[PDB]
Design a protein around this ligand. Structure first.
Ligand SMILES: OC[C@H]1O[C@@](CO)(O[C@H]2O[C@H](CO)[C@@H](O)[C@H](O)[C@H]2O)[C@@H](O)[C@@H]1O
Ligand SMILES: [Ca+2]
Length: 556
């Protein structure tokens, strides 16, 4: 048999708000993305995942939806959306949209009705509960600061919100709400959408009785919210009522779940989701409070990857990504973003990204080597997660504003949201007005127009890697094997399929290193290298590596 298209596709994540503005209001829009499809097509992209594009008050930039069937005013009209669809099809590309059904905006008609009275027909579309002992129903904290329970004076009860107070959680325990959600998914699927990424898919099921979390659970509340007892019954129901009738690919953002539970979401035999976005790797150096960082080495990096890969087993499938809209920039996070090493290391990371087993997702800008942004004050962050950390750690005296800044400058998701750098015109060609979030000053040296024609740019290296992966089955669907989980200097692994074996070797040190191939293995050909002065000799049994050198080889 053949492997589904999604297992050998290369996806690109577009955060519309920061991709391309075409009417100078400072916010990216659909017309801007449509206008750039040739750029994505030329890069070699097969499919695009776009962040939320529905009507939203934007308290959380698309993730607080006020109407699942209208497009966000800032991005355009349904007509623009359809046009995007049509233009992607002409290029043989597929669109994956974001599905945010753990919560809705508090401006959605369902919630406006729900909060009116305890007897309103929409009361149970959400979670309403009496406070206890003079305060909230229980000790549940919110991802974005303070309590997860908000009191509504209209009825005297509190409603639940794992996220923003303007993002009340939807009540999956209510059949009528589930059916409405299924009918809303068909509305988009009927328009031809090829894939759906499920926002915080592991938190749909709530714990009966809402008992207080234990002190330990409070330490990692994100994990506790992924343990609802009806989760998989609900995901299986959604697959049977909806996905069974279409040929869309499903990808779940399993945030907060213990890795050992991931197979329940992706084992194809369970008929739940097709693939998984996990966070063990991207948060491998993040502390439990989600804002401090902890020092890690390449040994920790590869070991996490091996664990995640082993979790897909035979019937499951993983996505692979080094960056997205909720995390710091890939080259700053995992590579070395100092001027003299940024390009070499961004190419190294590209080699890792495109040779991993699973479906890779390239986050907008990483193909250029975009970096974290030089925040100077807390006022430079738009992110509500940061305002939340201020409320929970500074106002409470657990940390000073300076300590918060020092740390969130390295972890804030806003590092990934500064406008895409198209060229060196005003605001790097992202807008003719004022960008909603400041463009990085390094756009003068890091921009698409400058890299596109240069054979040695980070962009060209990504383009070349994508081509190589597309022509080498082993690099998408082949087996994966880490050659030395304990080595903290050089990442080396093999990918194999149908008797064909490839070797990937990436130096993660800003110093020369050597690599001896497994005994019995010899280089056969060199497919590509970055930052290398000369390819190895056919038959080489070892490799000399320059600082941050990466290479893909066919062995024998
Ligand atoms: O970004 C912060 C925070 O939210 C997570 C889910 O736990 O991600 C998804 O849902 C959020 C709320 O809907 C969005 O703000 C975010 O953009 C979306 O990916 C995690 O990434 C993280 O804990
Ligand atoms: Ca615009």
């Amino acid at each position: 048999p053949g492997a589904p298209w999604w297992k050998s596709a290369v996806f690109y994540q577009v955060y519309p708000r920061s991709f391309k503005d075409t009417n100078g209001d400072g916010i990216g829009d659909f017309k801007g993305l449509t206008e750039k499809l040739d750029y994505l097509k030329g890069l070699g992209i097969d499919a695009i995942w776009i962040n939320p594009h529905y009507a939203s008050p934007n308290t959380d930039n698309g993730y607080d939806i006020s109407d699942y069937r209208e497009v966000m005013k800032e991005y355009g009209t349904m007509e623009d959306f359809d046009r995007l669809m049509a233009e992607l099809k002409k290029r043989g590309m597929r669109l994956m949209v974001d599905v945010v059904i753990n919560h809705s905006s508090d401006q959605h008609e369902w919630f406006k009705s729900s909060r009116a009275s305890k007897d309103n027909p929409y009361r149970d579309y959400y979670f309403w509960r009496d406070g206890k002992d003079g305060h909230e129903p229980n000790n549940y904290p919110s991802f974005f600061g303070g309590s997860a329970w908000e009191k509504d004076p209209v009825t005297g009860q509190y409603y639940l919100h794992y996220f923003g107070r303007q993002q009340p959680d939807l009540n999956w325990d209510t059949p009528k709400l589930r059916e409405e959600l299924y009918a809303m998914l068909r509305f988009w699927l009927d328009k031809g959408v090829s894939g759906m990424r499920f926002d915080t898919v592991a938190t749909y099921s709530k714990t009966p009785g809402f008992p207080d979390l234990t002190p330990e659970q409070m330490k990692n509340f994100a994990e506790a919210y992924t343990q609802g007892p009806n989760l998989h019954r609900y995901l299986q129901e959604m697959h049977e009522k909806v996905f069974d009738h279409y040929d869309a690919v499903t990808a779940g953002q399993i945030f907060g779940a213990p890795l050992n539970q991931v197979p329940l979401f992706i084992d194809s035999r369970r008929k739940e989701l097709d693939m998984a976005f996990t966070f063990d790797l991207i948060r491998y150096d993040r502390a439990l409070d989600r804002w401090h960082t902890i020092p890690r080495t390449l040994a920790d990096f590869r070991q996490t990857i091996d664990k995640v890969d082993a979790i897909a087993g035979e019937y499951g499938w993983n996505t692979f990504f080094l960056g997205n809209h909720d995390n710091p920039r890939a080259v700053s996070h995992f590579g070395d973003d100092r001027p003299q090493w940024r390009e070499a290391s961004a190419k190294a990371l590209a080699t890792v990204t495109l040779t991993q087993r699973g479906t890779p997702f390239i986050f907008q800008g990483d193909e250029l080597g975009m970096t974290n942004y030089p925040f100077k004050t807390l006022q430079d962050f738009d992110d509500i997660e940061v305002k939340g950390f201020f409320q929970d750690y500074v106002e409470t005296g657990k940390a000073t504003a300076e300590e918060l800044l020092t740390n969130v400058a390295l972890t804030s998701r806003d590092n990934a949201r500064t406008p895409f750098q198209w060229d060196d015109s005003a605001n790097a060609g992202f807008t003719t007005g004022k960008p909603w979030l400041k463009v990085n000053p390094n756009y003068t040296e890091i921009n698409a127009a400058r890299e596109i024609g240069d054979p040695k740019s980070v962009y060209s290296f990504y383009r070349n890697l994508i081509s190589i992966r597309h022509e080498t089955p082993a690099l998408s669907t082949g087996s994966y094997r880490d050659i030395d989980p304990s080595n903290a200097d050089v990442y080396a692994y093999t990918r194999s399929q149908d008797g064909e074996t490839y070797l990937v070797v990436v130096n993660f040190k800003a110093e020369p290193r050597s690599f001896t191939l497994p005994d019995g293995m010899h280089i056969a050909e060199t497919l590509i290298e970055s930052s290398s002065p000369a390819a190895p000799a056919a038959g080489a049994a070892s490799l000399e590596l320059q600082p941050w050198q990466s290479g893909i080889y066919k062995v024998k």
